[PDB]
Design an enzyme around this catalytic site. Structure first.
Site, PDB file in Angstrom:
ATOM      1  CB  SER A  47       2.890 -20.153  72.578  1.00 30.42           C
ATOM      2  OG  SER A  47       4.145 -20.746  72.873  1.00 30.42           O
ATOM      3  CE  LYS A  50       3.338 -23.135  69.142  1.00 33.13           C
ATOM      4  NZ  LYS A  50       3.781 -22.709  70.504  1.00 33.13           N
ATOM      5  CB  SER A  95       2.351 -24.747  73.033  1.00 31.54           C
ATOM      6  OG  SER A  95       2.603 -23.390  72.740  1.00 31.54           O
ATOM      7  NE  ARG A 227      -0.555 -19.977  81.501  1.00 29.68           N
ATOM      8  CZ  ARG A 227       0.092 -20.667  80.568  1.00 29.68           C
ATOM      9  NH1 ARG A 227       0.778 -20.028  79.627  1.00 29.68           N
ATOM     10  NH2 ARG A 227       0.039 -21.992  80.560  1.00 29.68           N
TER      11      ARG A 227
HETATM   12  C1  LIG Z   1       8.636 -19.438  74.667  1.00 31.30           C
HETATM   13  C2  LIG Z   1       8.028 -20.833  74.482  1.00 31.30           C
HETATM   14  O1  LIG Z   1       8.947 -21.825  74.960  1.00 31.30           O
HETATM   15  C3  LIG Z   1       6.688 -20.899  75.220  1.00 31.30           C
HETATM   16  C4  LIG Z   1       5.938 -19.657  74.735  1.00 31.30           C
HETATM   17  O2  LIG Z   1       4.513 -19.703  74.899  1.00 31.30           O
HETATM   18  C5  LIG Z   1       5.917 -22.231  75.099  1.00 31.30           C
HETATM   19  N1  LIG Z   1       4.492 -21.967  75.119  1.00 31.30           N
HETATM   20  C6  LIG Z   1       3.888 -22.413  76.224  1.00 31.30           C
HETATM   21  C7  LIG Z   1       2.513 -21.999  76.591  1.00 31.30           C
HETATM   22  O3  LIG Z   1       2.290 -21.370  77.661  1.00 31.30           O
HETATM   23  O4  LIG Z   1       1.577 -22.254  75.796  1.00 31.30           O
HETATM   24  C8  LIG Z   1       4.705 -23.216  76.914  1.00 31.30           C
HETATM   25  S1  LIG Z   1       4.249 -24.109  78.270  1.00 31.30           S
HETATM   26  C9  LIG Z   1       5.353 -25.435  78.676  1.00 31.30           C
HETATM   27  C10 LIG Z   1       4.628 -26.779  78.650  1.00 31.30           C
HETATM   28  N2  LIG Z   1       5.129 -27.528  79.822  1.00 31.30           N
HETATM   29  C11 LIG Z   1       5.427 -26.518  80.859  1.00 31.30           C
HETATM   30  C12 LIG Z   1       4.150 -26.163  81.610  1.00 31.30           C
HETATM   31  N3  LIG Z   1       3.882 -27.085  82.729  1.00 31.30           N
HETATM   32  S2  LIG Z   1       2.690 -26.472  83.635  1.00 31.30           S
HETATM   33  N4  LIG Z   1       1.620 -27.618  83.992  1.00 31.30           N
HETATM   34  O5  LIG Z   1       2.017 -25.436  82.910  1.00 31.30           O
HETATM   35  O6  LIG Z   1       3.226 -25.941  84.859  1.00 31.30           O
HETATM   36  C13 LIG Z   1       5.893 -25.282  80.097  1.00 31.30           C
HETATM   37  C14 LIG Z   1       6.082 -23.197  76.293  1.00 31.30           C
HETATM   38  C15 LIG Z   1       7.136 -22.769  77.320  1.00 31.30           C
HETATM   39 CL   LIG Z   2       5.341 -20.419  69.273  1.00 32.31          CL
END
Ligand SMILES: C[C@@H](O)[C@@H](C=O)[C@@H]1NC(C(=O)O)=C(S[C@@H]2CN[C@H](CNS(N)(=O)=O)C2)[C@@H]1C
Ligand SMILES: [Cl-]
Ligand SMILES: *C(=O)[C@@H]([C@@H]1NC(C(=O)O)=C(S[C@@H]2CN[C@H](CNS(N)(=O)=O)C2)[C@@H]1C)[C@@H](C)O
Ligand SMILES: C[C@@H](O)[C@H]1C(=O)N2C(C(=O)O)=C(S[C@@H]3CN[C@H](CNS(N)(=O)=O)C3)[C@H](C)[C@H]12
Ligand SMILES: C[C@@H](O)[C@H]1C(=O)N2C(C(=O)O)=C(S[C@@H]3CN[C@H](CNS(N)(=O)=O)C3)[C@H](C)[C@H]12
Ligand SMILES: [Ca+2]
Ligand SMILES: [Ca+2]
Ligand SMILES: [Ca+2]
Ligand SMILES: [Cl-]
Ligand SMILES: [Cl-]
Ligand SMILES: [Cl-]
Lengths: 242, 242
Positions: A47, A50, A95, A227
């Site tokens: 992501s 983006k 996201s 992160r």
């Molecule tokens: C491949 C894509 O599906 C992926 C690629 O970035 C998407 N981008 C992101 C990102 O990290 O920005 C997420 S985070 C997602 C939101 N709710 C959970 C997080 N809960 S917590 N609080 O963090 O434990 C997971 C997506 C999975």
């Molecule tokens: Cl994305």
């Protein structure tokens, strides 16, 4: 060139993590990292893509402005915040992948490739599905290559309109207080091993800008909060933020 | 419509203060205040005039961009904040009246007047010194009028370039987190009675914008922090921010 301050490895060590943090001091034109090798290791952007996706969509008029509404397609997906209408600001904030996959199809393979080449973005390779290559296709970018791209964006130097770059930097806004402004974007790449989490962006001060890009091993969704936490421990250690 | 909410007065009286908070719900097109009469009382804008001043300066090319440096020109004129270089971002943040005096002299009274009439800004009157009328001249603006002006700025509807409005809104960034974004500007009017403090701007939510304008009696500088404090307590009371 790029100084290796291994004392940063303590911050991964305490949290039982492996990863890299890279900082760039814009005034001093000097970079710092805990791991020069991992700093230049290229991964799927996930992501973090983006950022260029948004820029290209805006520059080509696929996105008219940050107020245009993208209707939820009615598919109930796993992340609850995706299951509603969005504009650019909230699609970035939460996201919202479906909105960006739609952007990518409207942009098209040919314009996407030409723009990524214009951007010198990572390895410039968009092999795969036009709407998923940054998740499971052939594009790869390193933490140092994220910095390179972000520095251009900060200076309005990418080969898109100034307006596009200003709008995307507005949409990247994450945190701001009297001491600093952070513009950044997280990512989590899972569809291809290794599983890793990203945080890339920069810290705006009164007198300087510190760019950053980090990635870390992320076996489970557990450690996703690390992160930002690890990056901020580094920033604090270097006294960039109070 | 304008609804009166006298319950907000508890936040002024507990701080031995008197003032007005005006809120505007953009989605609902509805305004709320503790004091309808004071909400429409017009005062000197003082440093809140930095918003229209910066817009005009940018639109006319007096300021090239938010990176252009305004060098300190020697003078250690009492105030320490004015003892260093500035750009638009930092000059908005801190009291540096010589910088904005220089803008206004370069804009000149003919274009200043024309612009404030095009903005429908306050009583649209620039009588007095061209380099200080917003501090001791004839210009006056009410809290409700601040809202009307800011709403146009938010919508890029003022008769200046879109780019200048985007830059000023960047410069207005005050606070941002996962719950809200505040773009705002303080002011402190002392040169003509009554001494008052201002805070005007808006709160960006995921799905709405709440514009605000407050002013309060300010007999000494020790109450300046109450501008933000009281506004935020009213926003919290209304559940606009947590
Ligand atoms: C491949 C894509 O599906 C992926 C690629 O970035 C998407 N981008 C992101 C990102 O990290 O920005 C997420 S985070 C997602 C939101 N709710 C959970 C997080 N809960 S917590 N609080 O963090 O434990 C997971 C997506 C999975
Ligand atoms: Cl994305
Ligand atoms: C503009 O109105 C005026 C500036 N603006 C302000 C203001 O607070 O809006 C001041 S206050 C002055 C500078 N900072 C000191 C207070 N520090 S703090 N942290 O706010 O308490 C006092 C100043 C007078 C211009 C036109 O003079
Ligand atoms: C208070 C404002 O003035 C802030 C601003 O702006 N500042 C800069 C800057 O200008 O960078 C820094 S950063 C800090 C100073 N130097 C250390 C490392 N420098 S170093 N050798 O690693 O490059 C980290 C401060 C936050 C200060
Ligand atoms: C969770 C996010 O989506 C937020 C967002 O956006 N929200 C809006 C909004 O849309 O305004 C509000 S404000 C709140 C709800 N209504 C009260 C006053 N209503 S009223 N009739 O007095 O004006 C105050 C929430 C913060 C929610
Ligand atoms: Ca290339
Ligand atoms: Ca209270
Ligand atoms: Ca004078
Ligand atoms: Cl370059
Ligand atoms: Cl001023
Ligand atoms: Cl911004």
């Amino acid at each position: 060139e790029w100084q290796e301050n291994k004392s940063w490895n303590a911050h991964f060590t305490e949290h039982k993590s492996q990863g890299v943090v890279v900082l760039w001091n814009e005034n001093k034109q000097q970079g710092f990292t805990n791991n020069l090798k991992r700093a230049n290791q290229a991964f799927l952007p996930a992501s973090t893509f983006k950022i260029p996706n948004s820029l290209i969509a805006l520059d080509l008029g696929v996105v008219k402005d940050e107020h245009q509404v993208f209707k939820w397609d009615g598919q109930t997906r796993d992340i609850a915040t995706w299951n509603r209408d969005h504009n650019l600001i909230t699609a970035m904030k939460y996201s919202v992948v479906p909105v960006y996959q739609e952007f990518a199809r409207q942009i098209g393979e040919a314009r996407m490739s030409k723009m990524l080449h214009a951007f010198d973005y990572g390895n410039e390779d968009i092999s795969g599905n036009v709407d998923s290559f940054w998740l499971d296709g052939g594009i790869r970018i390193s933490a140092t290559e994220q910095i390179s791209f972000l520095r251009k964006l900060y200076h309005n130097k990418l080969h898109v309109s100034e307006r596009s770059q200003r709008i995307v930097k507005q949409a990247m806004l994450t945190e701001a207080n009297g001491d600093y402004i952070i513009r950044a974007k997280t990512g989590y790449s899972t569809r291809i091993e290794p599983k890793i989490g990203w945080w890339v962006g920069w810290v705006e001060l009164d007198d300087n800008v510190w760019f950053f890009a980090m990635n870390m091993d992320m076996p489970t969704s557990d450690g996703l909060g690390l992160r930002q936490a690890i990056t901020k421990e580094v920033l604090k250690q270097e006294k960039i933020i109070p």
